[PDB]
Nucleic acid binder design. Structure first.
Ligand code: MN
Ligand code: MN
Ligand code: MN
Ligand code: MN
Ligand code: MN
Ligand code: MN
Ligand code: MN
Ligand code: NA
Length: 325
DNA sequence: CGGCCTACG
DNA sequence: CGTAG
DNA sequence: GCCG
């Protein structure tokens, strides 16, 4: 089992769901306390389990697995023995964890804001709604739409959104294309938002495109909020006899950068952090969603496909459905 | 030990 | 500060 | 918290 998540296939569904979920609770809690290192280890340990070919039944099976030390092994051992891990359950029912989770789920609120509100004594959404003067416009939008934004986005929703985005893109720039990215491109059947990547086959024609797309969506009455090359929107999506708010991300890239942006925006988040870590630490190359840089020769790699990028980095190709680290 | 991804709004 | 995978 |  290789040590980096980008070196192994990770399918969406797997054979250690309960164990991975417990470790991801501890990862999330570490993040709420500002410990990114512990968050990463627990996330990586969870991802290792997702990549295994069968269920872990006995502690012996963790021997030699990367990112399993005394702490993560004890969590698994307790789950195997007792069906529950006392530490995990303590986190789950803690006021700190529950409140940090509720607040950080709000669009516009991160760990730092949530933590300060927690220290001020705030605990519920209505607590925040009682003094709206201190909220940002982004936070006001996230709070007003929080209930809708908590309901899973379905595949049917995605197909409907893509058609309306394509119509606005077509008027903004004939020939421009729309690609579904994020978790739905990895095969997820539900999600918290929809991610789209927009380009044009003629290099440079995409310049200035996103403002033109947003204006046309806004004049169609589809934009509840927005909020350049990345737009974090809230869309009004029709429903049977009504509608619901849905988070949509629209991102533009020139065709020269499209493979890097496609790779980055398809994720998973952990997969891309690991891929960038692998690139720099093992290959001496600097990767982002714009390109791949050799700092020794001071040159950018040209890529025409995701396959090109995996080849550049010396990695076996993984389709999106195997990037669910 | 130091590192832990790397951007844009 | 927030956002993204 | 773990690696390397
Ligand atoms: Mn410990
Ligand atoms: Mn026991
Ligand atoms: Mn997404
Ligand atoms: Mn998104
Ligand atoms: Mn750019
Ligand atoms: Mn240290
Ligand atoms: Mn996200
Ligand atoms: Na948030």
């Amino acid at each position: 089992m290789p040590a980096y998540a980008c070196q192994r296939p990770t399918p969406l569904t797997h054979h250690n769901t309960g164990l991975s979920e417990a470790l991801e609770i501890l990862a999330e809690a570490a993040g709420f306390e500002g410990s990114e290192g512990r968050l990463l280890t627990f996330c990586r340990a969870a991802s290792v389990l997702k990549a295994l070919p069968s269920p872990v039944t006995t502690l012996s099976q963790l021997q030699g697995l990367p990112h399993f030390g005394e702490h993560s092994s004890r969590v698994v051992q307790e789950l195997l023995e007792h069906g529950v891990c006392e530490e995990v359950e303590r986190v789950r029912r803690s006021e700190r964890y529950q409140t940090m989770k509720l607040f950080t789920q709000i669009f516009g609120v991160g760990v730092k804001t949530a933590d300060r509100w927690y220290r001020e004594g705030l605990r519920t959404l209505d607590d925040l709604r009682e003094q709206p003067q201190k909220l940002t416009q982004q936070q006001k939008a996230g709070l007003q739409h929080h209930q809708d934004l908590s309901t899973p986005v379905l595949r049917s929703d995605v197909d409907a959104l893509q058609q309306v985005v394509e119509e606005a893109v077509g008027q903004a720039l004939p020939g421009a294309t729309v690609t579904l990215t994020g978790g739905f491109r990895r095969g997820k059947l539900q999600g918290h938002d929809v991610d789209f990547l927009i380009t044009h086959p003629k290099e440079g024609q995409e310049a200035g495109l996103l403002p033109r797309v947003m204006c046309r969506l806004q004049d169609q009455g589809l934009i509840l909020y927005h909020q350049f090359e990345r737009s974090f929107c809230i869309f009004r999506l029709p429903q049977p006899g009504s509608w619901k708010a849905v988070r949509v991300d629209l991102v533009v890239a020139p065709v020269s950068q499209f493979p890097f942006a496609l790779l980055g925006w398809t994720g998973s988040k952990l997969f891309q952090r690991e891929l960038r870590r692998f690139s720099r630490k093992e290959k001496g190359l600097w990767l982002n969603s714009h390109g791949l840089f050799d700092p020794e020769q001071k040159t950018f790699f040209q890529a025409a496909s995701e396959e090109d990028i995996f080849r550049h980095l010396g990695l076996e190709y993984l389709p999106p459905e195997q990037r669910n680290a």
